[PDB]
Design an enzyme around this catalytic site. Structure first.
Site, short mmCIF file in Angstrom:
data_model
loop_
_atom_site.label_atom_id
_atom_site.label_comp_id
_atom_site.label_asym_id
_atom_site.label_seq_id
_atom_site.Cartn_x
_atom_site.Cartn_y
_atom_site.Cartn_z
N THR A 147 0.87 -1.21 0.00
CA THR A 147 0.00 0.00 0.00
C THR A 147 0.89 1.24 0.00
OG1 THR A 147 -1.99 -0.95 0.98
CG2 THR A 147 -1.62 1.38 1.41
B1 LIG Z 1 -2.03 -2.13 1.79
O1 LIG Z 1 -1.19 -3.11 1.18
O2 LIG Z 1 -1.57 -1.86 3.12
C1 LIG Z 1 -3.49 -2.65 1.84
C2 LIG Z 1 -4.39 -1.52 2.31
C3 LIG Z 1 -5.82 -2.05 2.58
C4 LIG Z 1 -6.56 -1.02 3.45
C5 LIG Z 1 -6.59 -2.29 1.28
N1 LIG Z 1 -3.57 -3.83 2.73
C6 LIG Z 1 -3.65 -5.08 2.24
O3 LIG Z 1 -3.70 -5.35 1.05
C7 LIG Z 1 -3.76 -6.20 3.29
C8 LIG Z 1 -2.50 -7.01 3.49
C9 LIG Z 1 -1.40 -6.16 3.72
C10 LIG Z 1 -0.44 -5.96 2.74
C11 LIG Z 1 0.66 -5.13 2.97
C12 LIG Z 1 0.80 -4.50 4.21
C13 LIG Z 1 -0.16 -4.70 5.20
C14 LIG Z 1 -1.25 -5.53 4.96
N2 LIG Z 1 -4.76 -7.13 2.77
C15 LIG Z 1 -5.91 -7.38 3.40
O4 LIG Z 1 -6.23 -6.84 4.47
C16 LIG Z 1 -6.78 -8.27 2.79
C17 LIG Z 1 -6.37 -9.10 1.74
N3 LIG Z 1 -7.28 -9.99 1.15
C18 LIG Z 1 -8.59 -10.04 1.62
C19 LIG Z 1 -8.98 -9.21 2.66
N4 LIG Z 1 -8.05 -8.33 3.23
#
Ligand SMILES: *[B]([O])([O])[C]([C][C]([C])[C])[N]C(=O)[C]([C]C1=[C][C]=[C][C]=[C]1)[N]C(=O)C1=[C]N=[C][C]=N1
Ligand SMILES: *[B]([O])([O])[C]([C][C]([C])[C])[N]C(=O)[C]([C]C1=[C][C]=[C][C]=[C]1)[N]C(=O)C1=[C]N=[C][C]=N1
Ligand SMILES: *[B]([O])([O])[C]([C][C]([C])[C])[N]C(=O)[C]([C]C1=[C][C]=[C][C]=[C]1)[N]C(=O)C1=[C]N=[C][C]=N1
Ligand SMILES: *[B]([O])([O])[C]([C][C]([C])[C])[N]C(=O)[C]([C]C1=[C][C]=[C][C]=[C]1)[N]C(=O)C1=[C]N=[C][C]=N1
Ligand SMILES: [Cl-]
Ligand SMILES: [Cl-]
Ligand SMILES: [Mg+2]
Ligand SMILES: [Mg+2]
Ligand SMILES: [Mg+2]
Ligand SMILES: [Mg+2]
Ligand SMILES: [Mg+2]
Lengths: 233, 196, 222, 195, 226, 212, 204, 195, 196
Positions: free
Chosen positions: I1
Site C-alpha cells: 500500500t
Molecule cells: B495495503 O497493502 O496496506 C493494503 C491496504 C488495505 C486497506 C486495502 N492492505 C492489504 O492489502 C492487506 C495485506 C497487507 C499488505 C501489505 C501490508 C499490510 C497488509 N490485505 C488485506 O487486508 C486483505 C487481503 N485480502 C482479503 C482481505 N483483506
C-alpha cells in the site's frame, strides 16, 4: 503486554547548585527508520516541573494528557492553585510512579522510562526516575537508555556525590549536558542532532530551550582513516 | 549501511557512509566501506563486516595472483570471483557487495551482488539498509553519461537522504573516483551534506 | 514478551543483640551492569520501633514497605493507638506476602526491633511469606557470601576451645553494639570486594529502647 | 534394568541383583541373571539401558579373559575396576555412550581382602563397604548405615542383605521378582540358590 | 571489562582494567588483560579470558617464528591478519575481543579485533562492557596531536570511567606505552584507586579452635637410598 | 525434608528434620517443621515452606472456630479433611505440600492422616514424607512394633531422621521430637545432628563406614 | 543436568608466611543422594599439589592424566616439576579441549623448591589462570568460600595459624551448601615438610 | 490409582480393587479401599488421578444418599450409573475435569438381576458381564473371554477372579499389593476378608 | 500500500494506490483506500482492510453524531477519534491511517496515525509499505504552500515511484482534493503515471 512501536531515545539530566537541568532529542524512531523529526519529549507541568519521557511515543502522549488533566483537576475548588496548593514535582512524580507500577501489575505497562525534574516549594532540587516496571530511584545525575551508559559517566565527573552539587554552577552543568548530547549523537544510532533542553532554577524559574543543535563536532580525522588494516590507498 | 556505485562519462564513482553498528550502538562512526581489490577495481561493502572483509581479502589475493600470471583483470572477472565466494558459501555469509572498476577498453562498470550471490551488471547500483529510502530519488535523478561534478552531487544528495532516514547509516560520506586519470578519494562531512 | 520482574541488586543484613537490634543494607541500586544510584535508601523506619527492608526487585520492595507502613497506621486507628509488637508485625507481613502467592513480591524481607521483653529481635521472610525469628540473617545478592561468616563469627560455629581439641565448644558469649557494627562493616567490605552489585555506601539502622539511630559508612565505588 | 546391591564383609563380597526384565507393561522374564564373571575371583553386576548392559558386560568379560590368557595371571579387582572405569569414561564422550552402571565385587588373592567398587555410566568410581545403583540406595543405605559392621561374617552379610530386600519389596512400587545372590571370596564365585 | 587504545605523536598507548567476573562474582581482582604478542606489539583483550590469552599466545608464538624466519622485526598488520583469520575461521566461538597496538619499521599502529574476525582502524578505540563509559570520555577529551603524557592521561581516564560506572569493570588500571624508536614500557598497576580499607577486626583464631580427627606426614620426596 | 509419624502402644511419635534449601544453598538449619495446632493436634510440614506454614497456621484457626461453635474439640478426621478440602480447591494452581495431621481423641484414639497438595488424604499407622522419606522408611520398617516403650519409640523416630539427615542432601540441621498421648502432645527437645551423629555412632556402633 | 553440580564438592587454597595450605571436602553424591564420604579431591605430583572440584569422573581422569604427564616430565627433565610450570601444563591441557571441556575447577598449590616462594593458582574449566596472592576457591560453595576467605584471611599467617583460618573457611562454607561436606581434609605445606589433617565436621 | 476389576455372575456382582497407594518411589499404603457404598445394593469402585478419585466418589455418595432420604427409596443401579455418567460427561468440558474412572456394581431388587457398569472419565458408559479400567483389561479380558460363563456361581466368579489376579501378579511390572474383593447381591454388600 | 496526504495553499489532497493483496495474489486491483468520515474530512487507509474499514465506519458514526449535536467537527477532533480507537485497541489492530481535512478557519490539515496509535500533525504525510521507497524523493521535493497542480504532480510522481518498487502497491492512483470549493475525485491510470 505489547511492543513499543514509535520510540524516543535517551533523556538525560543532572542537579546543580540552584536547580536541575534536563534534556532530550526531538526524534520519534520507527525501528531503524528515523521517522518523526519534530517530537517534543520534554513536557513542562506548571512553572516548577519538567517531565522527560523516553520509550513508546503513543504512551508518552497518553501520559502527556494525564498531566494536562492533573493540572485541570488540581485547580478545581482550589483558590491557592497558583500558590501554596500548586502542583509540586514530588506530587507529579508519585502520581506517575503509582500509575506505572499499577499498569505493570496488570501486565499492560506504559512502555516508557521517565525522569521528573523540578524544584520544590522550599527550593530543594527534585530529580527522580521511574519506568515501565515501576522501578524508582534518585541520583545527582539521571539518564535513560543509552544516556545511562554514556551520559552518566560524563555527568558524574562533574557531580560525583551530593556534596558536589553546591559547587556546580548552572553554566558548568549546562555545558556538561550539551557535551553529553553531542556524545550521544556520535554513538547512538537512534538519536538526532536536534534537541530540547530545560532548566528549572529556584531563582530564575523555568527556562525552556527549543530547537538546539549539536555543534563543534570532530570529524576531520576521518579523512586519514583508510581501509580496515593493510590497505594504504 | 548506505552504499552506491555510479558509472559516468569518464568512468565510475563509488560512494558510502561510515557507520558500523552493534544493534543501536555505533561501534565505528568513521568506517571505510570502500575497499580496494585492485588498482582500479574497488568494492562497496554492506552486511557483516567480518564476512565482507574476509571475502574482500580473498578476492584481493586472487586478483593479485591473476595479475602476476595473466596481467590486469577486467572488472567482470573481479565480479565473478566475488560471486563465486558469495554464491558457493551463501548459507554461511551475510554480504551485500557492489563491485565497481575502470578499464580503458570497457570504461566504467558496476556489478551488484546481493545476498543470494547473483550478479547484476547495471549503470548504477544502490545497496545496504539505507538504500530502501532512496530508490525513488535515485531512479528519478539518475542519468547516463553524467559529468564528474554531477555524479558527485548525485551520490552526495542520495546518500545524504539515506543517512537522514536510516539509523544504521551515518557519519561521513566517503567516495572513490575511478577514471583514466587515476584514483581520487573524496570525503564529505555532516555540516556539508545535512543542509542539502 | 513483557517481563514484570527485575533485579536491582543490593544486600541487607540483620543482627539481633541482647538489648538491641541492627538492620544494615548497602545503598547501591543497579540494573544489569549499570549503576542507577550510589545512594538509594533501602532500610526504613516504619514506626513503633520497627525497621524494615525488602531486598530484590525494588519496585516490589517499595510497594511492600509502603503497604506495611500503611498497616501500622491503620493498626493504630483500629486498636486505640496500640504499639504493634515485632511478632505481630511479622505475622502481618506474612499475609501481605502470601496475599500475592501466585504473583509474588520478588523480594527477601527482613525486619528488626525489640520483642515485648525488650530483647533484640530479627525476623526473616522468603518472597511468598514464610518467616522465622532469627539471631542473625543476611539477605539479597551477597547473602551467600555473608551468612557463612555470620554463622562463624556470631554463633561461633565450628569453633572450639584450645587444649580440648574438638571436645568443648566455644561458649556463646553475647555481643555488644560496638562489636556487632564491626562485624557488619567487615561483612559488607568483604561482600563489596567479591560481589559487583555491592558497594558505594553502607547504611545501618540501630534499634534500642531509646529509639532508632542511623550510621553511614563509605564503600568502594567500583 | 532395576536393582543391584553390593556389600563387602570380613572375608567376602556379596552381590544381589533383581531377576525381573520388563518391557513396557509386561514382565518378559523373572529369572534373569544380571552379572558376568570377569575372572575366577572377580564378578561384575550391571544395570542400565536395554542391550547396552549385556553388550558392555560381555565386552569387558572378553577383555579380562584375553588378559588372563596372555599373561597366565589374574588381574587384581582394583586393576579390573580401573580398566572398566576408563572404558566408561571413554564411553561418556562417544557418539553413543554406554548407558550402564556396574558393581564390581572381587577378592584380591595377593592382599587377602574382599573389595567392592561402584562405577556409574559416567566413569565415576568409588570403593565402598556397601553400594547400590538406581533407586535402590535410597532405601538400602539407611539400613546399611545402621547395621553394617566391618567384621561381619558372610552369613551375617546375607541376613543384612535379606533385610534390604524385604524393605525394597515393601516400599518400592516395581515388582522386581526377587534377587539372585552371589558370593565372591578366596575360593572363587558361587551362587546362593535359595533366597 | 574496559580496554582502550589511544594514538599519540610518536606512538600508541593501550590500557585496561583488572577485573574478571563470573556472573555477578569477581573471580580475580587484579587480572592482567594486557598481553605481549611481541616485544613492541601488545594487545588488550576482552570477552572470554582463556580465549584472549590462548589466541594471543598462539599468534605471538607464530609471530616469533616468522620474525626469525624473515630476519625482521614483526609488524602489527601481521599480528592483525593472523588474529582475524584465526577468529573468522572459528565463526565467533573463540570469544576474543582485542585492541591490537604496536610500533614497527612501518611506524605506529592501532587496531581493534572482534570475535567474528572484523577489524577496525582508529586513533582512539574502546572495547568491553565498559566501552561505552570509556568512549564517552574519549569522545569528550580526545584531540589530534596528543603528547605521550596526554595520551596516557586520556587512556587511564577512559579506563577509570569504566571502573567506576561499569559493574563489569573495576580495581586497577594497567597501561602499556609503545613509542617509536624506544623500548615498550609495560606499566603494571599504573593506578591503584581501589585499595581495601583496614578491617575493623582481626579474625585470627586461637590455635586448637578447629577439631581434628587424624594427622600424618605426606611423603613428597622420591624413593630413598639404602 | 524428612518428616515421620507412627502410631504405637504409647500413642504417636512425630519426628522431623530442620533444613530448608533453595537449590543447593542451605537457607536455614533451624526451621520448625512441626506446627502446634492445639494442645492435642500436630501438623508436619514438607514441600513449600510458606504453603505448609500459612495453611496449617490457618487450619488452627478453623479448628478453634469449630470447638467454639460445637463446644467440643475437633476430630483428627475433620481437622485433616478441612485442610485436604482447602488444598483441593487450589489444585492445579501450584501449591506444594506434604503433611501429616497427628492427634488423639476419645472417639478415634491416636490417629495420623497424610494430607498433600494433590488432594490425597490417607489414614495410616506409619508415614514418612519428604525428599529423605525413603531413608527414614528403611530404619522405621525394620525396627517398628506396636509394643514399643515411649522411650524406645522416641529413639527410633530420632534415629530414622538422623539416617535421612546423613544420606539426603536436602535434609539435616536438627531433629525435633514430639510424643502425642491421651493427654496431649509433649515436646522432647531440639537435637543438633552435628552432635547427635557422633553420639549415636559411638554408643550404637553404627555408621562404621564413616571415620571418627 | 548441570555437570558441575551433579557430584558436588569444594576446594580452597591459601598462602601464608613461607607456607601454603590447600583443603577440600570429602563428599561425592548423585544429586540429593550422598554416595561416598571418602572422595578426596586433592592430589600431588612430587611437591606440587592439585585440588580438583566438579564432575567426579573428570576429577579422576585429570588426576590420572597429570600423573601421566608429570612422570614423563620427570624422566626427561631429570627433576620434579615446579608449581609455576605445572600451572601452565594444566592450562594447556584444559584448553586443548576448548569445545569439549572437562567439567572441573582445578586449584594448584605448592612452594617453589629453588626460590622458596609460596604459590597458588586457580582455573576455570577451559584453562584460564587465576594466580592470586591471597587465596583461591572452587566448587559448589564458591560464593560461600569467597565470603569466608575475604573476611577471615590476613597475609603472612604462620603455618599453625593458617591451618585454623583455612579450616574455618572450608567448614562454614560447606555447612551452607547442600552438596558439600561429609568430612574434610587440610594440607599444610612447608618447603620440606607436609602435614595432612582430617577435620571433624557435621555429617549432614 | 492402579487396578480395578468387575465381574457380573448369575446372582451377584464382584468388584476387586488393588490396595496399593504409590507416590513417586514409595508405597505409602498397602491396605487402601478404593470403593464407596452409594446405596445398600450399589457399590462403586474408582481409579484415576490422586485426590480427584475420592473427592468424586464421596460427592456421588452424598448425592445418592440424599436422594434415598428424600424419596425413602433406593435408586436402581441403572439410574445411579446414568447419574454418575452425566456428572462425568458434565465434568469433561469443565475448567478442571474429574480425572476418574469407575465401575458400578449393583443388584437391582426390582428385576432380581446383578448389573455391572463401566464408566470412564469422559462419561463413556457400557453395561458389561465383566470389566476393567487401565492396563488391567489388557491382561484380564482374554482370561474372562475364555472362562466366563453367564450362569456362574459367586464361588466360581471368585475362582475366576483369582486367576485374573494371579496373571496380573505375574505379568504386571507394578506391585499393587493384592486386592480387596467385595460382593454385591440381593442381601447387600459384603467384603471377602481372605483373598 | 502506498498512501499520502499533502497540505497546500488552497487546502489538502489525499492520494493512494488501489492494490489489495493476499500474499502475492492481488485480491482487488481497483480498491478505494480514500474513505470519507465527514463531508470534508477523509482518511487514507493502510494495513488490515477489515480493521481500517471497521475503524473508519465507527469514526463516521461518531462524527455524524457529533455533527447532530455540536455542528461540524474539526479535523483535529476526527484525528482524536481515530487515535482513541487505534491506541486503546493497539493489541488487536493493524491499522496505519492518515487523516486529512479542510476547515475554513484552520484550512488544510494532515494527521498521521501509525501502528502504535500515536498522533502526528504534519505538513504532509506518507504511509504504507511503499512509502519506504519515497522518503528520499518526498523530502527533497516537498514545498509548503504549493498550488493545486503542483501538489497533484507531487503526489502523482511520488506514488508512481512507490508503485514501481513496492509489490504490495499498484493499479490506479486515486486522489481526493479538499478545498473551500468542494470535494473533487481524481484518477490516474498506469499508462499515464508509469511513463513519468
Ligand atoms: B495495503 O497493502 O496496506 C493494503 C491496504 C488495505 C486497506 C486495502 N492492505 C492489504 O492489502 C492487506 C495485506 C497487507 C499488505 C501489505 C501490508 C499490510 C497488509 N490485505 C488485506 O487486508 C486483505 C487481503 N485480502 C482479503 C482481505 N483483506
Ligand atoms: B552496514 O550497516 O551494513 C554495515 C556495513 C559493514 C561492512 C561495516 N554493517 C554493520 O554495521 C553490521 C551490522 C549490520 C547492520 C545493518 C545491516 C546489516 C548488518 N555490523 C557488524 O558487522 C559489526 C558490528 N560491530 C562489530 C563488528 N561487526
Ligand atoms: B571482561 O569482562 O571482558 C573480562 C576480560 C577477561 C579477558 C579477563 N572477561 C571476563 O571476566 C569473563 C566474562 C565471561 C564470563 C563467562 C563467559 C564468558 C566471559 N570471565 C572469564 O573469562 C572468566 C570467568 N571465571 C573464571 C575465569 N575466567
Ligand atoms: B523440605 O526440604 O521439604 C523443606 C521443608 C520446608 C518446610 C522448609 N522445603 C524446602 O527446603 C523447600 C525446597 C525444597 C527442597 C526439597 C524438596 C522440596 C522443596 N524450600 C523452601 O520452601 C524455602 C523456603 N524459604 C527459603 C528457601 N526455600
Ligand atoms: Cl568494515
Ligand atoms: Cl479496503
Ligand atoms: Mg542516520
Ligand atoms: Mg562491588
Ligand atoms: Mg557412582
Ligand atoms: Mg553441607
Ligand atoms: Mg543431609
Amino acid at each position: 503486554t505489547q511492543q513499543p512501536i514509535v520510540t524516543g531515545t535517551s533523556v538525560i539530566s543532572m542537579k546543580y547548585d540552584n536547580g536541575v537541568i534536563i534534556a532530550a532529542d526531538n526524534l520519534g524512531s520507527y525501528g531503524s527508520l528515523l521517522r518523526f523529526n519534530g517530537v517534543e519529549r520534554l513536557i513542562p507541568v506548571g512553572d516548577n516541573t519538567v517531565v522527560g519521557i523516553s520509550g513508546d511515543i503513543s504512551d508518552m502522549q497518553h501520559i502527556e494528557r494525564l498531566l494536562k488533566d492533573l493540572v485541570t483537576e488540581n485547580a478545581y475548588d482550589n483558590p491557592l492553585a497558583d500558590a501554596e496548593e500548586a502542583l509540586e514535582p514530588s506530587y507529579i512524580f508519585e502520581y506517575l510512579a503509582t500509575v506505572m507500577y499499577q499498569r505493570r501489575s496488570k501486565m499492560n505497562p506504559l512502555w516508557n522510562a521517565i525522569i521528573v525534574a523540578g524544584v520544590q516549594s522550599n527550593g530543594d532540587q527534585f530529580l527522580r526516575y521511574v519506568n515501565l516496571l515501576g522501578v524508582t530511584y534518585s541520583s545527582p545525575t539521571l539518564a535513560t537508555g543509552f544516556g545511562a551508559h554514556m551520559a552518566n559517566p560524563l555527568l558524574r565527573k562533574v557531580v560525583d556525590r551530593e556534596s558536589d552539587i553546591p559547587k556546580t554552577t548552572v553554566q558548568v552543568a549546562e555545558e556538561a549536558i550539551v557535551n553529553a548530547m553531542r556524545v550521544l549523537y556520535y554513538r547512538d544510532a537512534r538519536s538526532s542532532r536536534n534537541f530540547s533542553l530545560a532548566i528549572i532554577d529556584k531563582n530564575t524559574g523555568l527556562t525552556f530551550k527549543k530547537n538546539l543543535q549539536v555543534e563543534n563536532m570532530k570529524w576531520d580525522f576521518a579523512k586519514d582513516i583508510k581501509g580496515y588494516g593493510t590497505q594504504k590507498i | 549501511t548506505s552504499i552506491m556505485a555510479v558509472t559516468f562519462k569518464d568512468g565510475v564513482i563509488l560512494g558510502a557512509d561510515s557507520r558500523t553498528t552493534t544493534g543501536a550502538y555505533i561501534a565505528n562512526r568513521v568506517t571505510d566501506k570502500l575497499t580496494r581489490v585492485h588498482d582500479k577495481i574497488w568494492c562497496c561493502r554492506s552486511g557483516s563486516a567480518a564476512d565482507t572483509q574476509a571475502i574482500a581479502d580473498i578476492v584481493q589475493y586472487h586478483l593479485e595472483l591473476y595479475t602476476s600470471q595473466y596481467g590486469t583483470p577486467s572488472t567482470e572477472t573481479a565480479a565473478s570471483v566475488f560471486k563465486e565466494l558469495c554464491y558457493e558459501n551463501k548459507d554461511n555469509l551475510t554480504a551485500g557487495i557492489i563491485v565497481a572498476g575502470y578499464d580503458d577498453k570497457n570504461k566504467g562498470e558496476v556489478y551488484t551482488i546481493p545476498l543470494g550471490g547473483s550478479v547484476h551488471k547495471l549503470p548504477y547500483a544502490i545497496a545496504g539498509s539505507g538504500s530502501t529510502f532512496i530508490y525513488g530519488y535515485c531512479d528519478k535523478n539518475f542519468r547516463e553519461n553524467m559529468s564528474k561534478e554531477e555524479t558527485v552531487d548525485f551520490i552526495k544528495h542520495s546518500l545524504s537522504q539515506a543517512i537522514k532516514w536510516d539509523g544504521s547509516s551515518g557519519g561521513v560520506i566517503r567516495m572513490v573516483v575511478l577514471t583514466a586519470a587515476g584514483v581520487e578519494r573524496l570525503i564529505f562531512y555532516p555540516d556539508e551534506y545535512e543542509q542539502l | 514478551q513483557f517481563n514484570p520482574y527485575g533485579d536491582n541488586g543490593g544486600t541487607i543484613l540483620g543482627i539481633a543483640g541482647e538489648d538491641f537490634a541492627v538492620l544494615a543494607g548497602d545503598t547501591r541500586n543497579i540494573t544489569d551492569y549499570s549503576i542507577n544510584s550510589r545512594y538509594e535508601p533501602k532500610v526504613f523506619d516504619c514506626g513503633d520501633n520497627i525497621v524494615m527492608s525488602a531486598n530484590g526487585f525494588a519496585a516490589d520492595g517499595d510497594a511492600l514497605v509502603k503497604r506495611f507502613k500503611n498497616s501500622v497506621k491503620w493498626y493504630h486507628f483500629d486498636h486505640n493507638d496500640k504499639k504493634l509488637s515485632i511478632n505481630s508485625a511479622a505475622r502481618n507481613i506474612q499475609h501481605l506476602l502470601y496475599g500475592k502467592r501466585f504473583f509474588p513480591y520478588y523480594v527477601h524481607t527482613i525486619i528488626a526491633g525489640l520483642d515485648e521483653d525488650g530483647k533484640g529481635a530479627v525476623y526473616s521472610f522468603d518472597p511468598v511469606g514464610s518467616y522465622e525469628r532469627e539471631q542473625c540473617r543476611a539477605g539479597g545478592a551477597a547473602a551467600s557470601l555473608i551468612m557463612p561468616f555470620l554463622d562463624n563469627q556470631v554463633n561461633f560455629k565450628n569453633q572450639y576451645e584450645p587444649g580440648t581439641n574438638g571436645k568443648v565448644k566455644k561458649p556463646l558469649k553475647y555481643l555488644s553494639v560496638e562489636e556487632v557494627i564491626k562485624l557488619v562493616r567487615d561483612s559488607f567490605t568483604s561482600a563489596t570486594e567479591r560481589h559487583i552489585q555491592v558497594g558505594d555506601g553502607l547504611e545501618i539502622l540501630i534499634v534500642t529502647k531509646d529509639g532508632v539511630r542511623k550510621e553511614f559508612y563509605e564503600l568502594k565505588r567500583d | 534394568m532395576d536393582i543391584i546391591l553390593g556389600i563387602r564383609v570380613q572375608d567376602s563380597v556379596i552381590l544381589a541383583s533383581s531377576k525381573a526384565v520388563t518391557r513396557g507393561i509386561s514382565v518378559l522374564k523373572d529369572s534373569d541373571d544380571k552379572t558376568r564373571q570377569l575372572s575366577p575371583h572377580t564378578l561384575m553386576s550391571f544395570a542400565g539401558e536395554a542391550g547396552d548392559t549385556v553388550q558392555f558386560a560381555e565386552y569387558i568379560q572378553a577383555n579380562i579373559q584375553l588378559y588372563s590368557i596372555r599373561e597366565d595371571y589374574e588381574l587384581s579387582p582394583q586393576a579390573v575396576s580401573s580398566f572398566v572405569r576408563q572404558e566408561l569414561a571413554k564411553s561418556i564422550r562417544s557418539r553413543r555412550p554406554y548407558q550402564v552402571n556396574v558393581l564390581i565385587g572381587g577378592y584380591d588373592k595377593k592382599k587377602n581382602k574382599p573389595e567392592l567398587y561402584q562405577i556409574d555410566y559416567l566413569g565415576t568410581k568409588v570403593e565402598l563397604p556397601y553400594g547400590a545403583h538406581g533407586y535402590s540406595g535410597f532405601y538400602t543405605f539407611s539400613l546399611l548405615d545402621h547395621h553394617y559392621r566391618p567384621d561381619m561374617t558372610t552369613e551375617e552379610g546375607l541376613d543384612l542383605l535379606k533385610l534390604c530386600v524385604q524393605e525394597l519389596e515393601k516400599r518400592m512400587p516395581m515388582d522386581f521378582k526377587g534377587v539372585i545372590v552371589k558370593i565372591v571370596d578366596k575360593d572363587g564365585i558361587r551362587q546362593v540358590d535359595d533366597f | 571489562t574496559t580496554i582502550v587504545g589511544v594514538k599519540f605523536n610518536n606512538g600508541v598507548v593501550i590500557a585496561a582494567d583488572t577485573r574478571s567476573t563470573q556472573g555477578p562474582i569477581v573471580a580475580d581482582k587484579n587480572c592482567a588483560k594486557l598481553h605481549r604478542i611481541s616485544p613492541k606489539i601488545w594487545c588488550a583483550g576482552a570477552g572470554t579470558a582463556a580465549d584472549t590469552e590462548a589466541v594471543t599466545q598462539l599468534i605471538g608464538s607464530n609471530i616469533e617464528l616468522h620474525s626469525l624466519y624473515t630476519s625482521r622485526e614483526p609488524r602489527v598488520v601481521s599480528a592483525l591478519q593472523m588474529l582475524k583469520q584465526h577468529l573468522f575461521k572459528y565463526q565467533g566461538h573463540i570469544g576474543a575481543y582485542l585492541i591490537v597496538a604496536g610500533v614497527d619499521p612501518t611506524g605506529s599502529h592501532l587496531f581493534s579485533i572482534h570475535a567474528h574476525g572484523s577489524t577496525d582502524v582508529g586513533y582512539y578505540l574502546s572495547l568491553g562492557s565498559g566501552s561505552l563509559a570509556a568512549m564517552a570520555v574519549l569522545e569528550s577529551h580526545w584531540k589530534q596531536d596528543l603528547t605521550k603524557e596526554e595520551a596516557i592521561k586520556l587512556a587511564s581516564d577512559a579506563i577509570q570511567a569504566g571502573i567506576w560506572n561499569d559493574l563489569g569493570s573495576g580495581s586497577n588500571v594497567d597501561v602499556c606505552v609503545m613509542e617509536i624508536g624506544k623500548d615498550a614500557e609495560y606499566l603494571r598497576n599504573y593506578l591503584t584507586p581501589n585499595v581495601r580499607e583496614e578491617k575493623q577486626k582481626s579474625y585470627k583464631f586461637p590455635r586448637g579452635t578447629t577439631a581434628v580427627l587424624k594427622e600424618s606426614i605426606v611423603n613428597i620426596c622420591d624413593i630413598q637410598e639404602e | 525434608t524428612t518428616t515421620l509419624a507412627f502410631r504405637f502402644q504409647g500413642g504417636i511419635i512425630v519426628a522431623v528434620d530442620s533444613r530448608a534449601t533453595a537449590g543447593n544453598w542451605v537457607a536455614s538449619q533451624t526451621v520448625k517443621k512441626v506446627i502446634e495446632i492445639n494442645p492435642f493436634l500436630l501438623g508436619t510440614t514438607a514441600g513449600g515452606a510458606a504453603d505448609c506454614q500459612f495453611w496449617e497456621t490457618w487450619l488452627g484457626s478453623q479448628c478453634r472456630l469449630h470447638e467454639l461453635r460445637e463446644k467440643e474439640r475437633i476430630s483428627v478426621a475433620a481437622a485433616s479433611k478441612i485442610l485436604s478440602n482447602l488444598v483441593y480447591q487450589y489444585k492445579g494452581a501450584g501449591l506444594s505440600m506434604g503433611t501429616m495431621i497427628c492427634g488423639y481423641t476419645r472417639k478415634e484414639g491416636p490417629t495420623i492422616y497424610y494430607v498433600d497438595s494433590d488432594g490425597t488424604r490417607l489414614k495410616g499407622d506409619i508415614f514418612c514424607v519428604g525428599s529423605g522419606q525413603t531413608f527414614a522408611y528403611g530404619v522405621l520398617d525394620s525396627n517398628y512394633k506396636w509394643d514399643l516403650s515411649v522411650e524406645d519409640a522416641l529413639y527410633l523416630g530420632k534415629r530414622s531422621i538422623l539416617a535421612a539427615a546423613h544420606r539426603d542432601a536436602y535434609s539435616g540441621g536438627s531433629v525435633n521430637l514430639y510424643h502425642v498421648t491421651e493427654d496431649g502432645w509433649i515436646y522432647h527437645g531440639n537435637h543438633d545432628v552435628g552432635e547427635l551423629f557422633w553420639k549415636v555412632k559411638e554408643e550404637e556402633g553404627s555408621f562404621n563406614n564413616v571415620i571418627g | 543436568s548441570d555437570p558441575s553440580s551433579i557430584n558436588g564438592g569444594i576446594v580452597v587454597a591459601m598462602t601464608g608466611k613461607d607456607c601454603v595450605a590447600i583443603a577440600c571436602d570429602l563428599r561425592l553424591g548423585s544429586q540429593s543422594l550422598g554416595v561416598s564420604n571418602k572422595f578426596e579431591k586433592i592430589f600431588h605430583y612430587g611437591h606440587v599439589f592439585l585440588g580438583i572440584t566438579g564432575l567426579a569422573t573428570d576429577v579422576t581422569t585429570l588426576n590420572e592424566m597429570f600423573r601421566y604427564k608429570t612422570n614423563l616430565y620427570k624422566l626427561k627433565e631429570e627433576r620434579a616439576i615446579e608449581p609455576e610450570t605445572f600451572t601452565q601444563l594444566v592450562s594447556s591441557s584444559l584448553y586443548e579441549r576448548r569445545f569439549g571441556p572437562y567439567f572441573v575447577g582445578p586449584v594448584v598449590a605448592g612452594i617453589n623448591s629453588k626460590s622458596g616462594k609460596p604459590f597458588i593458582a586457580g582455573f576455570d574449566l577451559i584453562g584460564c589462570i587465576d594466580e592470586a596472592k591471597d587465596f583461591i576457591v572452587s566448587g559448589t560453595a564458591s560464593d560461600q568460600l569467597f565470603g569466608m576467605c575475604e573476611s577471615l584471611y590476613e597475609p603472612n599467617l604462620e603455618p599453625e595459624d593458617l591451618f585454623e583460618t583455612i579450616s574455618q573457611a572450608l567448614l562454614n562454607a560447606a555447612d551452607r551448601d547442600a552438596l558439600s561436606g561429609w568430612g574434610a581434609v587440610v594440607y599444610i605445606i612447608k618447603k620440606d615438610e607436609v602435614v595432612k589433617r582430617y577435620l571433624k565436621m557435621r555429617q549432614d
